[PDB]
Structures are given as structure tokens and as C-alpha cells.
Amino acid sequence: MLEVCIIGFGFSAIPLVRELARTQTEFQIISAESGSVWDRLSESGRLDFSLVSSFQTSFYSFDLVRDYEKDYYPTAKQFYEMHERWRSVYEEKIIRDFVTKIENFKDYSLISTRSGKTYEAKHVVLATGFDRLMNTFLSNFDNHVSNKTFVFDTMGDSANLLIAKLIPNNNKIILRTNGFTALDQEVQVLGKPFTLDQLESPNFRYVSSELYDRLMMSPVYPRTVNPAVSYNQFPLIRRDFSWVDSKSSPPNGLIAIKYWPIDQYYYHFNDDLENYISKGYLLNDIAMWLHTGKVILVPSDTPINFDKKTITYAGIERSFHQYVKGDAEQPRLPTILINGETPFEYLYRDTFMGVIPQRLNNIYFLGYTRPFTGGLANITEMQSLFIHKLITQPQFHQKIHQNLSKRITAYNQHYYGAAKPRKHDHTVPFGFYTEDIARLIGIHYQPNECRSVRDLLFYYAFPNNAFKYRLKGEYAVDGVDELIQKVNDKHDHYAQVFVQALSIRNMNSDEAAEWDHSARRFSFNDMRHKEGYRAFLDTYLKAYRQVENISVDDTVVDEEWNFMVKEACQVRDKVAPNIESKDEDVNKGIRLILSILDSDISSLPDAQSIEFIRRLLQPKNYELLFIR
Ligand SMILES: Cc1cc2nc3c(=O)[nH]c(=O)nc-3n(C[C@H](O)[C@H](O)[C@H](O)COP(=O)(O)OP(=O)(O)OC[C@H]3O[C@@H](n4cnc5c(N)ncnc54)[C@H](O)[C@@H]3O)c2cc1C
Numbered sequence: 198m199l200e201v202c203i204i205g206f207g208f209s210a211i212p213l214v215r216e217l218a219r220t221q222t223e224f225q226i227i228s229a230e231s232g233s234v235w236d237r238l239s240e241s242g243r244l245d246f247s248l249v250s251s252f253q254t255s256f257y258s259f260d261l262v263r264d265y266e267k268d269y270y271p272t273a274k275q276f277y278e279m280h281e282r283w284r285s286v287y288e289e290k291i292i293r294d295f296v297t298k299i300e301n302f303k304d305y306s307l308i309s310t311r312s313g314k315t316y317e318a319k320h321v322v323l324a325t326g327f328d329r330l331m332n333t334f335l336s337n338f339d340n341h342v343s344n345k346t347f348v349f350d351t352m353g354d355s356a357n358l359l360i361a362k363l364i365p366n367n368n369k370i371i372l373r374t375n376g377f378t379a380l381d382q383e384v385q386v387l388g389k390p391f392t393l394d395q396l397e398s399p400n401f402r403y404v405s406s407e408l409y410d411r412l413m414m415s416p417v418y419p420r421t422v423n424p425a426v427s428y429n430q431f432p433l434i435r436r437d438f439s440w441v442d443s444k445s446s447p448p449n450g451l452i453a454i455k456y457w458p459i460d461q462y463y464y465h466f467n468d469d470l471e472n473y474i475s476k477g478y479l480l481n482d483i484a485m486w487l488h489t490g491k492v493i494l495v496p497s498d499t500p501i502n503f504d505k506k507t508i509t510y511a512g513i514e515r516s517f518h519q520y521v522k523g524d525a526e527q528p529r530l531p532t533i534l535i536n537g538e539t540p541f542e543y544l545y546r547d548t549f550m551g552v553i554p555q556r557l558n559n560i561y562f563l564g565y566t567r568p569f570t571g572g573l574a575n576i577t578e579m580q581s582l583f584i585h586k587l588i589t590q591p592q593f594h595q596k597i598h599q600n601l602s603k604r605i606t607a608y609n610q611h612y613y614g615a616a617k618p619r620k621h622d623h624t625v626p627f628g629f630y631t632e633d634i635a636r637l638i639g640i641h642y643q644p645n646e647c648r649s650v651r652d653l654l655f656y657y658a659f660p661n662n663a664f665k666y667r668l669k670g671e672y673a674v675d676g677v678d679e680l681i682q683k684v685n686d687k688h689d690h691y692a693q694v695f696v697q698a699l700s701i702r703n704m705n706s707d708e709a710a711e712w713d714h715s716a717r718r719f720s721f722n723d724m725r726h727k728e729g730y731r732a733f734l735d736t737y738l739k740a741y742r743q744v745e746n747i748s749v750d751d752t753v754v755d756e757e758w759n760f761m762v763k764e765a766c767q768v769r770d771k772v773a774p775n776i777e778s779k780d781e782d783v784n785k786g787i788r789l790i791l792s793i794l795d796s797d798i799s800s801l802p803d804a805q806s807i808e809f810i811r812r813l814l815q816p817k818n819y820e821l822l823f824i825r
């Protein structure tokens with residue numbers, strides 16, 4: 198009887214399929230003829246955008262190993278192209294069919310398809326993706342509507358992608374939301390560009406949750422009164438975070454819009470604008486939108502009749518052309534029958550690590566955990582290794598499953614606490630998830646096993662990407678030592694990250710928040726590096742309109758909008774005139790570290806930071822009750 202059935206093959210499943218081939222496990226893939234959202238975007242011609250995520254975190258270790266020279270943002274085209282390549286390799290093993298039902302028994306499951314064909318499989322893996330409502334807007338659109346008005350009850354990376362495509366057609370944007378978390382996807386660090394994922398040094402949570410919290414959460418929670426931070430100038434972006442009942446920060450369930458800030462966007466693309474836009478590099482700067490008023494925030498309770506289709510803001514009644522609601526992070530699970538009769542009720546919190554469900558035998562989920570920053574690759578690679586070991590190594594299987602529900606309770610206690618289940622429970626800091634998975638599999642690193650400060654940087658500051666845990670051990674990939682050398686050598690061994698955590702070791706949360714924003718340009722939501730790009734923005738529009746064959750008649754006065762903008766930006770007009778250090782501390786920190794790279798750690802004698810750097814071999818907060 199068939200050992201393994203993979204239902205659905207897009208991207209999530211590639212690494213697990215690679216691992217099955219390797220160990221020569223008997224597997225079949227069943228996967229729809231239609232394909233995914235991407236084959237949509239391929240047919241309609243709509244691949245004209247780029248990922249919010251860096252190569253290093255969006256593409257799998259066994260590709261990075263040969264294609265990685267420098268950090269870039271891949272295009273939707275490059276990402277689709279990489280799916281069709283791995284599709285091609287495995288097409289012989291793929292059955293084109295839709296599965297409509299799985300009857301799960303003690304030893305195996307019975308898979309029904311639309312064809313009517315039936316399959317028996319010992320283990321089954323669902324890698325079927327999500328149904329998403331804005332896919333419609335993204336797959337089906339028209340860049341001919343201009344000067345119209347749009348209301349969004351929700352903000353997110355797809356809402357942001359659509360706002361990027363509207364603004365050049367002098368469309369007017371209103372966000373009627375309960376606020377949102379948005380973060381510069383790229384950060385100038387002493388001249389060098391870093392992705393946001395590259396600066397989280399997540400293993401610092403082991404030193405203390407509180408150390409990590411104040412290092413991490415100042416751009417999210419409004420803990421600075423610095424009037425350059427969008428959350429002080431535009432207080433409507435603020436969310437209620439009272440649901441958060443966990444010592445883990447950032448908390449599971451936190452989501453974030455990743456945007457290009459204009460200055461980073463300038464730096465990368467100014468010298469060949471028409472081509473870079475052509476390729477799908479699009480200015481999606483929400484902070485710039487808020488500052489120009491090409492977008493405006495509005496209280497959530499700003500009533501409107503959907504029937505007359507108008508918006509009640511200030512002493513104005515603006516007729517809106519389109520209202521956009523959107524939230525469908527619901528996995529595409531076909532019906533699953535327990536003991537082959539009782540329907541299975543999906544709930545992210547009731548599965549272990551987002552992969553192991555509780556009343557089902559030999560059934561795995563792959564592609565349903567959402568990384569909070571970085572690409573899905575990071576998550577799906579480690580899921581792939583966790584699932585492969587569970588399928589192929591029955592002692593491992595027994596170890597996890599013995600006390601499956603104790604692990605799930607202990608997981609939920611650490612990450613969610615007492616909070617009621619939410620839509621976004623399935624979102625997680627990637628740096629915690631990957632480390633979590635790796636300590637279950639045992640391909641993790643020991644801090645006690647560091648001998649040099651160089652080793653202490655690898656452990657704490659090297660980002661917890663999937664390939665990080667594939668240098669050696671059970672899942673070692675050829676060429677990973679070279680990747681780590683490459684990357685290490687390009688980011689100064691992630692010293693700057695290590696130095697941050699050091700700098701804020703003695704501060705309280707309010708002290709850290711201030712320090713974190715005492716920079717000429719702080720990392721996230723810095724409204725001082727906006728005004729001086731209005732000249733460039735004008736280039737960008739003209740430039741955009743050329744590749745995309747647009748005329749917009751740009752002398753028009755939406756006079757009421759100009760007055761809606763003025764009322765919206767009130768707090769701004771009060772607070773931004775109050776304008777006027779991490780830069781220095783970091784400058785001297787990097788000095789100390791790059792000098793003592795090769796010093797034995799235990800040897801270290803007794804700026805008094807050396808004593809904390811010793812204690813880095815023996816962290817207090819390593820305990821994870823869901824792993825032991
Ligand atoms: C606009 C957009 C932008 C994104 N950008 C990024 C990004 O920048 N970085 C990043 O890391 N992630 C990104 N993602 C998320 C991720 O890359 C996608 O979800 C991608 O589709 C990988 O998903 P998957 O392999 O899990 O599922 P899919 O690509 O949906 O593949 C699942 C497959 O299962 C098939 N299938 C489903 N149900 C059945 C069934 N019952 N029987 C048989 N076959 C079935 C489907 O046809 C499909 O081919 C983005 C997603 C979207 C929509």
C-alpha cells in the first residue's frame with residue numbers, strides 16, 4: 198500500500214517532495230489541473246508586481262545554494278518561474294485530479310477525487326493553500342478607472358498592492374480601519390541596505406523575553422512620543438493590542454504590511470525607473486501616501502449608506518466608486534471524515550506547530566502557517582523537514598504523538614495564553630517557528646557550544662532562516678557553508694544586530710523605545726524622509742504612466758478631497774512642527790565586536806558588556822515546555 202499521498206503541489210510541498218525522493222519513500226502527488234492564483238496572474242498577464250520578501254527567505258535552501266549572490270526582492274514572475282521549474286522535475290509523480298473527501302482510519306485514509314478515482318495512503322499531506330477574496334481584485338481588475346474614490350474596511354499587503362496601482366490614476370484612497378501595523382521592508386544600516394527580517398535576532402528571546410520585547414516592539418506598540426513616527430502623527434493607524442496575553446513578543450497573531458519606503462525605493466531604482474516598474478518594482482509607500490494625503494485614515498465608525506454609496510467624513514459627502522472588504526485566510530481543506538464518518542473541524546490552535554491535527558491519524562498540514570516577516574519558504578522548508586521525519590522515522594513519530602495534546606496545550610500557553618482564537622493565530626515570528634521546529638527535529642544549535650564571539654554572532658544574530666539549520670546534521674544541504682560565508686561576509690557577521698541587543702540590555706521598555714527612534718533615520722515609519730521625495734514621486738508617476746499607457750489630466754482639482762485631506766492630517770499639522778543616539782552606540786559597538794571576533798568566550802576577562810557576552814553561553818529563558 199502507498200506510503201505517502203501529497204494533495205496539492207504549488208510551492209509549500211517542493212522541499213518535502215525533495216526529501217521523499219532522497220529517502221526513496223513511495224509517494225504520489227494529486228493536484229488540480231487548474232493550478233493556483235499564480236497561473237491566473239500568468240494567463241491574465243498580471244505577474245506585473247514583486248514579493249514583499251527577500252530571496253534569502255522566499256526561495257528554498259537547495260536553490261539559494263547556487264543562485265544567491267546578493268539580497269534582492271524577487272518578482273512575482275521569478276517566483277512563478279521557480280514553481281514551474283520544480284513542477285517540471287516532479288510532473289511524472291503528479292496526478293491531475295481534485296480531491297473532494299478524505300476518510301481517515303487508524304492506519305490510513307481513503308482519498309476520493311472528482312474523476313471518481315479512489316486512493317489508499319498510509320500518510321497524507323495537505324499542501325492546498327488558501328482561498329483569498331482580493332485574488333479576484335488582483336487576478337481581475339482594470340487600470341482604466343481614474344479620479345474615482347475607493348473605501349477599504351481592511352489594510353494588508355494585497356490592499357497595499359492595489360493602492361500602489363490606483364494612485365498613479367489620481368484615484369483617492371480612504372482607509373476606514375481599526376488601525377494597522379506597517380513596516381519598511383528595507384532599512385539603511387550605516388549605508389548598507391538590510392531587509393527587516395535580517396534584523397530580528399530572535400534567539401535573544403532566550404536571554405530574556407523582556408530584553409527581546411523592548412528590542413522589538415517599539416515600532417509596533419506606541420511607546421515613543423517621537424513626533425516623526427507615523428503612529429504619533431497619524432494616531433488612527435493604532436490598533437487595540439489588549440488581546441495579547443503572552444510573554445512571547447512579537448506575539449503569534451500579529452500581522453504587518455511590508456512596504457518600500459521611498460528613500461530605499463529611490464536608492465535602488467532611480468537610475469532606470471521605466472524598466473524597474475516594467476519588471477514589477479512598484480512604489481507602495483503607505484507612509485508617503487499618508488503624508489501627501491493621496492491616502493487618508495478615517496475613524497472605523499464613519500458611517501455610510503452602501504445603498505447611495507457615499508462616505509460621511511467632516512462636512513463632506515463624497516460618493517465612492519468601490520468599497521473593498523477582505524479577509525479569507527481559510528485553508529482549502531477538502532472534507533475529512535474521522536473514523537471515516539465525523540467531519541473534521543479545522544482550527545490552527547488545535548494542530549501542533551500548524552502541521553499535526555488531533556483526531557486524525559497520519560495526516561499532515563503544509564503551507565498554512567504564515568510568517569510575520571520574511572517569505573513562506575522559511576516556514577514550509579522546516580515544516581517539510583518536520584513532516585518528512587514523522588513519516589520516515591517511526592520513533593520520532595511516537596515521540597511527538599505520545600503527548601501530542603500536552604504539547605498543544607503547552608504551545609498555546611506560551612504563545613497565545615488565555616486569548617480567544619483569532620483569524621491570524623496562524624501568523625508567527627519566523628525566527629521563533631524555525632527554531633521551534635529545529636529543536637523538535639534536533640538540527641538546532643546549542644548556545645553552550647559557542648567557543649568564539651564569532652560563534653555567538655552566528656547563534657544569536659545570524660537570522661533563523663531554514664538554510665541556517667541545513668549546514669550539518671540530518672538535513673544538511675550541499676553548498677550551505679558557502680552561502681553562510683557569502684551572507685556572513687556581506688552583512689559584517691550581523692554585528693549591528695548583536696550590538697543593538699547589547700545597547701538596550703540595561704534600558705526599560707520606554708528607554709529602549711526612545712533610544713530606538715533617536716536616529717537621523719530610524720528603521721520604521723520615519724516621516725522626516727518623505728517631504729524631500731515629492732520631486733521624485735512626480736518622476737515615479739510620469740514614469741509609471743509611461744510603461745502602463747496612462748493619461749490622467751493631472752491639473753484637475755478634487756477640491757473636496759483636498760479639504761478631506763486637511764481635516765484628516767490635523768494631528769500631523771499640530772505635531773510634525775515639533776521635530777528636533779543609537780547611531781553612535783552602534784558605531785562604537787561594531788568597533789568592539791569586529792576586533793574581538795576570534796576571542797575565546799569563556800576566557801573573556803572580568804565596556805562591562807563582556808560579562809553579559811559571557812552569560813550568552815548560559816541563557817535563563819531557553820525552556821520551551823512543548824519541546825521536552
Ligand atoms: C498575491 C500574493 C503574493 C504573495 N507574496 C508572497 C511573497 O512575497 N513571499 C512569500 O513567501 N509568500 C507569498 N505569498 C504566499 C505564497 O507564496 C502563496 O500562498 C503560494 O501560492 C504558495 O502556496 P502553496 O504552495 O501553499 O499553495 P498554492 O500555490 O495555492 O498551491 C496549492 C495547490 O493545491 C491545489 N489544490 C488545492 N486544493 C486541491 C484539492 N482539493 N485537490 C487537488 N489539488 C488541490 C491548487 O490547485 C494548487 O496548485 C503570496 C500570496 C499571494 C496570493
Ligand SMILES: NC(=O)c1ccc[n+]([C@@H]2O[C@H](COP(=O)([O-])OP(=O)(O)OC[C@H]3O[C@@H](n4cnc5c(N)ncnc54)[C@H](OP(=O)(O)O)[C@@H]3O)[C@@H](O)[C@H]2O)c1
Nearest residue numbers: 329350351352353354355356375377378452568571572573
Ligand atoms: N509570506 C507570506 O505568506 C505572506 C506575507 C505577507 C503577505 N502575504 C500575502 O498578502 C496577503 C495578505 O494581506 P491581505 O490584504 O490579503 O489580508 P490580511 O492582511 O491577512 O488581513 C488584514 C485584516 O486583518 C485584520 N487585522 C488584525 N490585526 C491586524 C494588524 N496588526 N494589521 C493589519 N490588519 C490586521 C484587519 O481587519 P479588522 O480590523 O477588520 O479585523 C485587517 O484589515 C495575502 O494574499 C498573503 O498571501 C503573504
